[PDB]
């Protein structure tokens, strides 16, 4: 009940009024939009069933680490567990969200915004500069540069044998794995699931926050550029890379070309996720993205 949730928040230190609205669009969570007794708006997440324990533990450690090194806001998980996740509403809305009924992409920001490019580049620089020693201390996954390709090769085998893959996607992924010059000889801490729907910004485009941190680890930095090129296009990605390098972002000759292969590999990564988030709904939609059907 609303009273049940009020008790939990009280049982973890937070006093809420009895006025809540519920949202049902989530896969793993139900979402509650609450209000504390002083009038501040809150976001509650209640995982549906058992399963979410290690992700909620990990994401809380990631949030506490990244806020130390970011000049923009991330969710402040004052209550954190599979009983209840609660944080105050952040300052801005995402630059886009997906309409819940149709998945039509509704944009809260001008795509051409110069300020989005410069502030996203600065945020990318800040995320990718987080020291490996600190990532190690928080027990997060660390991919070495020489492990990247065998990892993907394993991913390709597993997704092929169970979900299936179009012949054209398989040949492109193998071409990718064969193209040595595309692969950086270093890895860095990355957000892991970064695109405009996970970036909060003012209407002028200035990044004010970044959300959904549960995938963050040390990996190929191009992963954090793929979501931009998919939505903003090749020319915008080039300007982003230039602003990034201007700030001291560590680049290599083929970062642009590697980012395009990463973006094209989206079907593979989603088929990988769908195999450990078991739904007929997900493997079917992953199947279509891979050129089957
Ligand atoms: Ca900070
Ligand atoms: Ca080769
Ligand atoms: Mg915090």
> What is the C-alpha separation between 163 and 88, in angstroms, rounded?
40
| Domain containing residue 110 | 96-290
Choose one of 53, 88, 123: the last residue of a domain: 88
Identify the three-state secondary structure at position 268.
helix
Stated resolution in angstroms: 1.9
Alpha helix segments (H runs only) across the chain? 2-11, 53-66, 114-128, 132-137, 148-162, 167-178, 223-232, 234-246, 255-264, 266-275, 280-289
Choose one of 62, 88, 114: the last residue of a domain: 88
Report how far ligand 3's centroid is from the alpha carbon of 223 (Å).
Answer: 25
Annotated binding site: 23, 27-29, 45, 64, 67, 70, 76, 87, 90, 93, 178, 180, 197-198, 212
Annotated binding site for guanosine: 87, 90, 93, 197, 212
Verify that 84 and 143 share a domain, yes or no. no
Verify that 147 and 269 share a domain, yes or no. yes
Verify that 49 and 115 share a domain, yes or no. no
Verify that 212 and 278 share a domain, yes or no. yes
DSSP state letter for 49: S
> What is the C-alpha separation between 227 and 260, in angstroms, rounded?
10
Judge contact between 19 and 45, C-beta under 8 A.
no
DSSP state letter for 90: P
Report how far ligand 3's centroid is from the alpha carbon of 61 (Å).
Answer: 9
Verify that 171 and 239 share a domain, yes or no. yes
Q: How many domains, in total, are found in the chain?
A: 2
The catalytic position among 193, 219, 220, 224 is: 193
Choose one of 51, 72, 88: the last residue of a domain: 88
């Amino acid at each position: 009940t609303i009273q049940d949730i009020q008790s939990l928040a009280e049982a973890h230190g937070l006093l809420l009024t009895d006025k809540m609205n519920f949202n049902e669009m989530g896969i793993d969570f139900k979402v509650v939009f609450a209000l504390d007794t002083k009038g501040q708006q809150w976001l509650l997440r209640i995982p549906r069933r058992d399963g979410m324990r290690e992700q909620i533990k990990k994401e809380k450690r990631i949030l506490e680490l990244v806020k130390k090194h970011l000049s923009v806001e991330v969710p402040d998980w004052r209550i954190s567990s599979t009983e209840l996740v609660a944080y105050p509403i952040l300052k801005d809305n995402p630059v886009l969200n997906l309409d819940a009924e149709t998945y039509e992409i509704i944009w809260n920001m001008d795509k051409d915004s110069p300020k989005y490019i410069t502030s996203l580049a600065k945020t990318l620089f800040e995320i990718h500069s987080i020291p490996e020693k600190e990532v190690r201390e928080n027990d997060l996954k660390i991919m070495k540069p020489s492990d990247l390709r065998p990892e993907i090769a394993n991913n390709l085998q597993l997704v092929k044998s169970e979900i299936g893959i179009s012949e054209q996607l398989e040949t492109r992924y193998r071409k990718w794995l064969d193209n040595d010059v595309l692969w950086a000889d270093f890895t860095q801490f990355i957000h892991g699931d970064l695109y405009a729907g996970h970036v909060l910004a003012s209407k002028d485009g200035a990044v004010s926050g970044v959300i959904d941190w549960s995938t963050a680890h040390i990996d190929d930095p191009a992963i954090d550029f793929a979501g931009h090129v998919t939505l903003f296009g090749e020319e915008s990605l080039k300007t982003l890379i230039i602003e990034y390098e201007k700030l001291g972002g560590k680049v290599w000759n083929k970062l642009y070309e590697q980012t395009l292969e990463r973006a094209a590999a989206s079907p593979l990564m989603y088929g990988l996720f769908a195999l450990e988030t078991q739904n007929e709904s997900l493997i079917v939609g992953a199947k279509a993205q891979l050129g089957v059907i």
